[PDB]
Write a protein that binds this ligand. Structure first.
Ligand SMILES: [Mg+2]
Lengths: 136, 52, 386
RNA sequence: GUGAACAGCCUCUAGUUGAUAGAAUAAUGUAGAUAAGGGAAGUCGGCAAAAUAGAUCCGUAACUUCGGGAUAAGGAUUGGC
RNA sequence: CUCUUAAGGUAGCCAAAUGCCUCGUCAUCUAAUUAGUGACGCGCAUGAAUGGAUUAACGAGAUUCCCACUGUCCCUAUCUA
RNA sequence: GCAGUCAAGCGUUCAUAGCGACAUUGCUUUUUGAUUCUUCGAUGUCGGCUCUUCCUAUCAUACCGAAGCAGAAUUCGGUAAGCGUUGGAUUGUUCACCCACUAAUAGGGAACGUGAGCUGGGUUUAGACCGUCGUGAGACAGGUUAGUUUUACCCUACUGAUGAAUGUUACCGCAAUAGUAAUUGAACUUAGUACGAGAGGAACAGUUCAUUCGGAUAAUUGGUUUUUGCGGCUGUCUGAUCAGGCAUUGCCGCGAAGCUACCAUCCGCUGGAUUAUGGCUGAACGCCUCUAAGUCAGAAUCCAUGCUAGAACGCGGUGAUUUC
C-alpha cells in the first residue's frame, strides 16, 4: 500500500520493481508512469523495491503533457500483469500494468479510469474506487 | 463453492485450479490449466481443437 | 575494515550441525506438562505421511476481509492406522537427569515388531522375545514385581507402542516402535492403564480431535551433498568469476587465521530432524468410513484417496489425520505427531473448522474429475466398455 | 539432392569406425539450453547473452566532395495442392 | 605611449585527447548526472604545413544517449554432454 | 577525532533545561605527521563485489530518568551491541554530492579483513596523442587512449562422511557439553478522545495485515524437459507404402514425473532472574533520607522452557546369544 489508505492489504505477488514503466489509466494527460520508489518497501541489500496492486509508488511521467513531466508524483497501481493468488484460491492476472496519478493522501489528480481495476486496490483507495469502471 | 468452466475447453474448474485472465475490455477468461491457456494465447480456435 | 554495507547473515546457527540425522525416526525431545487431574491418554502418535490435497472452507475470523468467505487451503494427509501397546517404561529423577529404571513387555509380541530387532529376519531363528515370555508362566511374580517397581519409584511413565505398518501400503514389513509419555493422572493409574492395554490397540481419535493444534516431528527429505548457494541462500557470484560462482567469496578475514564455525560451507542438505509446531487439525478420518472425503456440504460417497492413488504412496484404507498446510518429511516417511507443549489461546488456534469440500482429483497430472462417476458423466461412453 | 552457391545439412564411389576401459550421476566446474513479472535497476562500461537476418513487392530523412548516405528508417508477403 | 628581447597571437577554435583552480558558469537531458551535449572565455599553459578551422564517406579506435533486446540484475531454479 | 573541570556569557527574567568564551586536564589509534624497529635470495600494491566476526563514542528498535515536557513533535541523559541499518543518478574512486524510500538509512576494527576468492575501472613497464619544461636525449602523484590477474593433489582450520578397540549382536533411551532466533512497521478501534484559546492532537487493552529474517514443504499456480511421452515441420537417405535413420538433443506446440520460487504454500514457544530507574520499611544523625542491614516493581538483557547435535575414551533400561 502506502498511507492515507483505508484498510489493510493481504500480500500479493510483486510485479513491478523500480524502473518499470506502466500505463496511465486516467484522464490526467499522462501516457506513462515510471516507477522510482515504493511506499511500503523495507530493506535488503541489492533488493529492488517493487510494487503490486494497490500500492502507492513514487513516479515520474516519462511521456505526456509537458506540464506533467520532469517531476516526481504519487501513483497508485490498478493493474498488474504479474500473476497473483487471492485467498479464495484463484491465481489471476491483468493484460497490462497501469497506475493512476494521485496526491500523498490518495485523491486522484484526474477523474476517470480506463480499463478494469483490481478489487484489492479499489478496496484500499475510496477515490480510485469512486472513479472506477469495472472492478476485477 | 462454485465450479467454473474452462472458457476455451469447456472443462470443469474446481477451486484453486488453473488461472484467470482479465483482458483489456473487462472480458474475464478462465483456464483449467496451462495447456488450454497456452493454446488460447496462441490464438487457436476451440471449435478446431478436437478434444474441447 | 568493516563490511561496506550491512545485511543479515545467511542461515540459522541454531540448526547446526547441518549433518544427517542419527536416525530416520526423529526423536521426541519434550512431552506436554503432565496434568495428573485428567484421564490417562497418549501424548503423541505414530504415522505415515501419504501426501497433500486441497480444502475449501468458510473462514471464521471477525475483522478480516475474508471473514464469512470461502478460502482454499493446502492440507497434508498423514496415514494413521491404530498403534499397539507392548510395554511400559519407568523413569526416575536423578541428579544426572531422567533414567530408565526398568521396562516390562507384553506376553505376546507381533511379527511386525519382532522384526524390528532383526537385521536379517528371513534367515534367522526368530528367537526374539521367547525366553522373556516364559516370565509370564509363574502366574505373576517376575512381571508383577517390575510393575510394582515402577509404581513405587518412577517419576514419569512411558508406553512402548508400534505401528501396524502392514495395514499400510508400504513395502516395509519391519514396524516402527517408540516410547510415549502417559499424561493421565497418577503414576499408579499410568502403569495400570498400561498393563490393561498390553497387546491391545489405541487409535488417534482417543488422542487428537478436530481443530486441535499439533506439532510435527520428522526427519526432513534428504538432498545429499549441497553447494553453498542452495544450502545457505548465499548470493551468487558474478558470471565472470574464474573457477566458479556458486561459492562464497570471502570464507574469512586474515585473522583469526582459521575458517570460522559460522561461515557457509558446502555439505549435506536435507535429512535433518525437525520439530515443526502448531498445525491445526482439519479432519480425524475413520478407516471403515466410505465418506472420508465427504462433507455435510458435498454429500457424495468418496474416500479421501484421490483418483489414481496418493502418488508414490497408495490408498488410504485406515483412519487418518488431516492437518492444515505442510509438514516436515516426505511421503512414506514415519512421522511422530505430538500434541502441544502449551495452550495456545490464540484465535487462529481457537477457530473451529468445518470443511466445505475436499479435493480428490488425480495428483499424478492436471486432474479434471473427482470420481469415476463424474468422469463418466462428463465424457459419455468410450470405445472400451459396454 | 536442397540452394545463389566449391556454404551449411544428407548421400554415392573410396576410405575410416582410431584415439584406455567399467560402474555411478554428489558438490564445484567446463561446454550446450530455457525461464513467470520487471527490463540495464547489474556494471568502470550492456562485458556476456538476447533481439535482427534469406527473397519478392512497397517505402525511405538530415547531410553531401553529388559519387554517396541506403539493406537508411519503416511495412506487407512466403507452405501445400 | 612605454619597457624587456626580434615580434607581441591575426584568421580561427576551447574546461577541447591541450584549463591548474575545477565536480568552472549558464542552458539542455534525468526523479537525481564529478557523465554527455550546446554555449560562454584575461585561454594556469588554444592557435595557424612545429599547420589552424571546416569536412561527406570510411573505422573490431575513445565517448554520450535513444529504440529494440535480453537471467547483467531483482533472484534465483531447472535440464544435457 | 572524542570526552572532561571552571563559569564570564547566551537563554524575555534565570550561569549550568539546552548551551558555553577565556583558559585548562585528558582519552583514542579508522586521519595525517614524526621515527626507521621488522621485511629489498619479494609479506601481491587501490576501490568495488562477496561473506563472517568483533568494537560502542548508539542512528533505529525495548524500558527508563530530565526539559525553557500543555498536547503532538523534539531535545538531554541512563541500562543497553539482543536486532536492524537500504534502492539509485554522476565519479576507478575511498571520500563527496543529489534523488528516493525508510523504524533508522550510526561510526569503526579484523595485515588501510577479504586477488592460489573474483574483478581489473585507477595508480604502477614497454605503444601512442597533448600541454608545460628542455638545445637535445628526455622529464613532469598534469590531462589522454591501448595494454597476459599463474599453482593446491600437502599440513592445519572449516564443512560434511566412515571408523579399529572395550564378550557378541539388536532395540529403546538419558543429557554433560556446544549451538540457538526472530525482527520491525501500519490500519481498525480506543478517538477527533486526553491536552489545548486555537491550530492541532496521542497512548495502553482489543482486532486485522505487512516488513526484514529463519525452518520446512510441492495440494495449487509458475519455471524447467532425453519422459527424446504425443503431435506438427524442413532437408536428405531407405524404389513407393507403412515405418524409420541422419542433421552433437535437427526445429516447433503441448507435455506428466522429479526438482524447484516472497513467482508458490505452511509453521516460527513461554517461564523465571536481573539492569537502568522508581519505590517500601529504615538507621547512620531521637529529625531527614530508595540503602547502610532488609525489601518491592522492573528492559529488545540474561538463565531456563523450547529447538539442533550427542561426548566417536559420558551413561541407563531391554531382547537374543552358536555342533558343524
Ligand atoms: Mg612519476
Amino acid at each position: 500500500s502506502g498511507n492515507g489508505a483505508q484498510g489493510t492489504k493481504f500480500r500479493i505477488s510483486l510485479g513491478l520493481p523500480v524502473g518499470a514503466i506502466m500505463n496511465c489509466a486516467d484522464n490526467s494527460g499522462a501516457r506513462n508512469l515510471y516507477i522510482i520508489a515504493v511506499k511500503g518497501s523495507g530493506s535488503r541489500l541489492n533488493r529492488l523495491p517493487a510494487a503490486s496492486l494497490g500500492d502507492m509508488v513514487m513516479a515520474t511521467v516519462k511521456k505526456g503533457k509537458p506540464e506533467l513531466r520532469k517531476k516526481v508524483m504519487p501513483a497508485i497501481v490498478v493493474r498488474q500483469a504479474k500473476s497473483w493468488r487471492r485467498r479464495d484460491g484463484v491465481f489471476l492476472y491483468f493484460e497490462d500494468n497501469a497506475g493512476v496519478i494521485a496526491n500523498p493522501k490518495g485523491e486522484m489528480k484526474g477523474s476517470a479510469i480506463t480499463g478494469p481495476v483490481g478489487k484489492e486496490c479499489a478496496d484500499l483507495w475510496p477515490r480510485v474506487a469512486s472513479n472506477s469502471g469495472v472492478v476485477v | 463453492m462454485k465450479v467454473e468452466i474452462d472458457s476455451f475447453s469447456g472443462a470443469k474448474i474446481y477451486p484453486g485450479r488453473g488461472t484467470l485472465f482479465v483482458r483489456g475490455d473487462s472480458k474475464i477468461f478462465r483456464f483449467q490449466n496451462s495447456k488450454s491457456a497456452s493454446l488460447f494465447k496462441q490464438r487457436k480456435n476451440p471449435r478446431r481443437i478436437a478434444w474441447t | 575494515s568493516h563490511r561496506k554495507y550491512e545485511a543479515p547473515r545467511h542461515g540459522h546457527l541454531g540448526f547446526l550441525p547441518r549433518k544427517r540425522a542419527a536416525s530416520i525416526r526423529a526423536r521426541v525431545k519434550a512431552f506436554p506438562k503432565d496434568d495428573r487431574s485428567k484421564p490417562v491418554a497418549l501424548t503423541s502418535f505414530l504415522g505415515y505421511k501419504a501426501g497433500m490435497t486441497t480444502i475449501v472452507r468458510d473462514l471464521d475470523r471477525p475483522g478480516s476481509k475474508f471473514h464469512k468467505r470461502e478460502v482454499v487451503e493446502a492440507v497434508t494427509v498423514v496415514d494413521t492406522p491404530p498403534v499397539v501397546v507392548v510395554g511400559v517404561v519407568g523413569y526416575v529423577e536423578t541428579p544426572r537427569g531422567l533414567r530408565s529404571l526398568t521396562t516390562v513387555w507384553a506376553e505376546h509380541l507381533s511379527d511386525e515388531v519382532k522384526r524390528r530387532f532383526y537385521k536379517n529376519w528371513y534367515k534367522s531363528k526368530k528367537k526374539a522375545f521367547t525366553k522373556y515370555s516364559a516370565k509370564y508362566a509363574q502366574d505373576g511374580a517376575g512381571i508383577e514385581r517390575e510393575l510394582a517397581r515402577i509404581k513405587k519409584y518412577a517419576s514419569v511413565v512411558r508406553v512402548l507402542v508400534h505401528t501396524q505398518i502392514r495395514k499400510t501400503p508400504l513395502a516395509q514389513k519391519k514396524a516402527h516402535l517408540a516410547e510415549i509419555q502417559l499424561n493421565g493422572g497418577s503414576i499408579s493409574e499410568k502403569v495400570d492403564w498400561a498393563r490393561e492395554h498390553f497387546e491391545k490397540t489405541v487409535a488417534v481419535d482417543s488422542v487428537f480431535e478436530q481443530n486441535e493444534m499439533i506439532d510435527a516431528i520428522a526427519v526432513t527429505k534428504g538432498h545429499g551433498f549441497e553447494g553453498v548457494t542452495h544450502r545457505w541462500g548465499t548470493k551468487k557470484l558474478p558470471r565472470k568469476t574464474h573457477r566458479g560462482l556458486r561459492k562464497v567469496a570471502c570464507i574469512g578475514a586474515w585473522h583469526p587465521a582459521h575458517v570460522m564455525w559460522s561461515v557457509a560451507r558446502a555439505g549435506q542438505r536435507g535429512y535433518h530432524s525437525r520439530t515443526s509446531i502448531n498445525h491445526k487439525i482439519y479432519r480425524v478420518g475413520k478407516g471403515d468410513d466410505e465418506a472420508n472425503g465427504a462433507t455435510s456440504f458435498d454429500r457424495t460417497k468418496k474416500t479421501i484417496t484421490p483418483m489414481g492413488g496418493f502418488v508414490h504412496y497408495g490408498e488410504i484404507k485406515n483412519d487418518f489425520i488431516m492437518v492444515k498446510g505442510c509438514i516436515p518429511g516426505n511421503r512414506k516417511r514415519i512421522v511422530t505427531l505430538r500434541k502441544s507443549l502449551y495452550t495456545n489461546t490464540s484465535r487462529k488456534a481457537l477457530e473451529e473448522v468445518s470443511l466445505k469440500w475436499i479435493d480428490t482429483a488425480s495428483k499424478f497430472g492436471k486432474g479434471r474429475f473427482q470420481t469415476p462417476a463424474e468422469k463418466h458423466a462428463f465424457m459419455g461412453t468410450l470405445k472400451k466398455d459396454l
